[PDB]
């Protein structure tokens, strides 16, 4: 009891997070796209809907709360989330950071300028709403550009004045998750204000032990994620990858039975909208994950216990590893 | 009389448009940034103020209308563009298009795609505004992307439409103007209907008259930059040149005198904020140019008169072919 965490409705108490799933999206976008194209959504209304059906099926299925990880440069719109996040009773934390398509004005900032504009959004509110950012979202795609090496700089040092945790978009086979450690450490984070995400798009061990020994939390966001059946189909290939579902999940079991049950935490990366990518992809993955944001406790949660995860175990990765990753630190 | 060309007030007759300067920006930024991070410009009161003020100035050398060629990624506000407008009494024509800094949810469309986004903006309205696009950006920096291969074409496919014109951004001292108008042409794009943009960075005057030629209007539209005397400040000089206003001023008269006096659009590519280059870029360029956008009335067009060019030859380019030029054709 008393420690809170920022939702796009307003405070919460850490407690009443409960099911958490920690790297999610309403809407896969750019900067200013939704307000300059909605049409390409349908509309903005349809595009809620959608999002307000997902979150309701994903709270009937025991979701209680999602950490939408959408930076400014992924079009994140704090109005929408608000917006679904009431209809349809799931808390929402929303981020600040940049992620890899960030635009010259954010590209031509200096380490403090970034620093800023991450305090900005996590102290003050995003744009005029007072809506407060509960994450710092950052990302590489191999070795960090030099720019992208500021901004964990300024991620670590907003954290560190803040106390909110950083979550890392990683290209998980190039094993960015060290580089990553290196510059958050370099800069005196703790690694346990840290996750190291998409860490389910490899099976290296190696890697993922390596973190979590450190004391990162390893994150294993990408559940649903496959494109087994679909192998004609190029973009869905390089997007989802050729491994199963169950691969993905055994990753779960494999850290708890090395020890590593409090360094895990589970997502997703669903969305229910998505213009960052090929035209129509959202009508691929609604027909891979019929399930959406439900397919965690529906299907994984369910594999875990018939492989012998105890419920104890299960509930401390879903309920006390988010509660104790987001509690400001 | 009869004519109307849109602007961010509203419709005008194009006979009113007046002494015109076609390629200028109320501020230079990305999708998102102004409403994300309004700090940057002090805040969004101060950037209206300074930019009224430079408005009124401009009104007061004898400008009556911009063309704020701001695209959707260059982060035009078109509720700020009104509100200046408004407040200094100078008409604003608003931009369609893309620039060179495209988000990943404008880069993954196809033609198709793009050209009904740009007719939104020109047909429908920008945001949810009802406020309606005047003129489509577009931009190249060297030889195309294929990216950029597709806004042109579909830049080409909306002007058709619509008879709206179409400007450029180049990379002057590579010529990309010839290749800019081979993908128009290619489209079926009447030469008349583009300008050919930054064409005063370069002093190829084989390369202007062959545009010039083809019935292509050349814009002469960096009229003021000049890092003459700031040899030591490297953003500077890459972002002015080393070329001095007369030079580029010189070129104005360059192709009057060899009879392209109707092909000619002068400008000076303002601005009042700029948050996409290096930081206090707009207190070097403030020091370089006092007179902001009335710079183009208060020294080039009397340096030109001097020179020897008559007052009608004068009017013609920057009233009758401004006006020719925006005239939904
Ligand atoms: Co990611
Ligand atoms: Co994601
Ligand atoms: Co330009
Ligand atoms: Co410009």
Chains 1, 2 share one sequence.
């Not at 799933?21 to 307000?35: D, N, P, Q, V």
């Not at 958050?184 to 840290?194: D, I, K, M, N, T």
Request: charged share 20%; with cysteine.
């Amino acid at each position: 009891t008393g420690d809170l965490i920022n939702t796009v409705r307003g405070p919460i108490p850490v407690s009443e997070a409960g099911f958490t799933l920690t790297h999610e999206h309403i809407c896969g976008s750019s900067a200013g796209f939704l307000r300059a194209w909605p049409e390409f959504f349908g509309s903005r209304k349809a595009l809620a809907e959608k999002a307000v059906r997902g979150l309701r099926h994903a709270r009937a299925a025991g979701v209680q709360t999602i950490v939408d990880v959408s930076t400014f440069d992924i079009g994140r719109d704090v109005r929408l989330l608000a917006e679904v996040s009431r209809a349809a009773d799931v808390h929402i934390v929303a981020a600040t950071g940049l992620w890899f398509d960030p635009p010259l004005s954010m590209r031509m900032r200096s380490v403090e300028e970034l620093t800023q504009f991450f305090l900005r959004e996590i102290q003050h509110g995003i744009e005029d709403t007072g809506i407060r950012a509960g994450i710092i979202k950052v990302a590489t795609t191999g070795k960090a550009t030099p720019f992208q090496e500021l901004v964990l700089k300024a991620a670590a040092r907003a954290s560190l004045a803040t106390g909110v945790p950083v979550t890392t978009h990683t290209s998980a086979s190039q094993r960015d998750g060290e580089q990553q450690a290196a510059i958050f450490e370099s800069e005196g984070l703790s690694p346990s204000r840290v996750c190291i995400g998409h860490s389910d798009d490899t099976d290296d061990l190696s890697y993922l032990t390596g973190l979590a020994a450190r004391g990162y939390l390893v994150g294993l966001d990408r559940m649903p994620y496959s494109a087994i059946g679909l192998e004609g189909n190029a973009s869905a290939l390089a997007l989802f990858g050729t491994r199963s579902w169950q691969t993905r999940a055994l990753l779960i079991k494999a850290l708890i039975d090395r020890g590593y049950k409090d360094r895990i935490l589970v997502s997703h990366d669903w969305l229910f909208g998505f213009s960052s990518y090929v035209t129509n992809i959202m009508d691929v993955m609604d027909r891979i994950n019929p399930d959406g944001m439900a397919f965690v406790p529906l299907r994984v949660i369910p594999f875990l216990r018939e492989k012998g995860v105890p419920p104890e175990t299960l509930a401390g990765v879903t309920v006390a590893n988010p509660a104790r990753f987001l509690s400001p630190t």
